[PDB]
Amino acid sequence: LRRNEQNGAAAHVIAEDVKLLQFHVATMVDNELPGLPRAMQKSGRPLK
Amino acid sequence: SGLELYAEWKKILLSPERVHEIFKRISDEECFVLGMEPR
Amino acid sequence: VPAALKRLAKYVIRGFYGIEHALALDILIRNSCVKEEDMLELLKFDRKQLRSVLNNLKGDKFIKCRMRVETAADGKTTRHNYYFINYRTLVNVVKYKLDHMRRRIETDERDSTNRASFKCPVCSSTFTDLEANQLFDPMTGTFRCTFCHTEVEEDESAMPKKDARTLLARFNEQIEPIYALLRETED
């Protein structure tokens, strides 16, 4: 995201990147969010 | 809708920074009214 | 619509903004009210690239956007977008981009001072004069990090600061002309 903002990347690129960043942060805080995908550990086991 | 906010009066996405700036603009006295200790 | 406002908008947009966006501002100048689809047809650019530029423009609120609903002869639901430039919004948005440019330079200047002078190669990190002095021992007679066991030189810090100072002067000269145009606008 920092590099995209530095380069002035596409607004939709930055929007999707911010969406993924929000997803990652919220998932780290809580992996049991209602009606949202679960973050696996590349082996099918949901992260704690 | 999931983990994103939409403000509809027409309807636009509400980025976190907007809420951050609004909360910063909020004064300390209003925190007591809202039942949140400012300090 | 005095010509002075148009002159300000043209000069600022042409000198201190992007060419691809200036292409759209040209359409905005040509017509006060344009359909979004008509703006697309005039622009002759891909929808995805245009929508990226439009998202940037929406964020900066350079041009105000309104939504209008009307019933077509066929009767199928249709969504119609109108974008039009507002001088009062544009003047402030441009002016502040200008203004915050300076706050950034001042913050960089202050960070330069914030950085610590002492730096030690074996350590590979910046060190406070404080830490260097505590590491120094009166019996040994020389001041030297306790941990790495090598002398510390501060000359390396000086160089980049001097380079930045030169850049700031060039920025001031390049930004000089636009302020007179701004003054003509306030007139």
Place this chain on the structure above:
Amino acid sequence: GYKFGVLAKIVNYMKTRHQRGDTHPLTLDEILDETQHLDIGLKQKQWLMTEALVNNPKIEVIDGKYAFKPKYNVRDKKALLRLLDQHDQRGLGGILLEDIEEALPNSQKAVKALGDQILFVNRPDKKKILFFNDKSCQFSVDEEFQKLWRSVTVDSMDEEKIEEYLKRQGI
């Protein structure tokens, strides 16, 4: 189907003639003899003459005999530059480099002769779009200045906070 690919073949033959270089317009019946269109019915030819020949923009009509318009396609680099200037003035937009290439021999040399006056933009299909430069106003933008621009985001700044910043800074 019937009576469509034949028309396409005629139009392609016209392009082949133009790769030949015969500016002199030709008779439609002679074109049919060259393209082996005698078998086709006469009525379809008459319908083509009345409607399709006029609709086709490339086709032109002179002294009762049909041929391409030698004015439509670019012939000299100076005229290309003038056309670009007129298109910029009237908001037409740029023209496709593939069409300009088939129009004009050594179009790439023409563009090299243009140099700075002509601005070319790449496209995913590799087609090149050309825009005239503005002589009246010339400006230079430096990369460091563009970066210092780029970081700052007014979208972060809230409109009321905008008018408030002006009022605070006492002006």
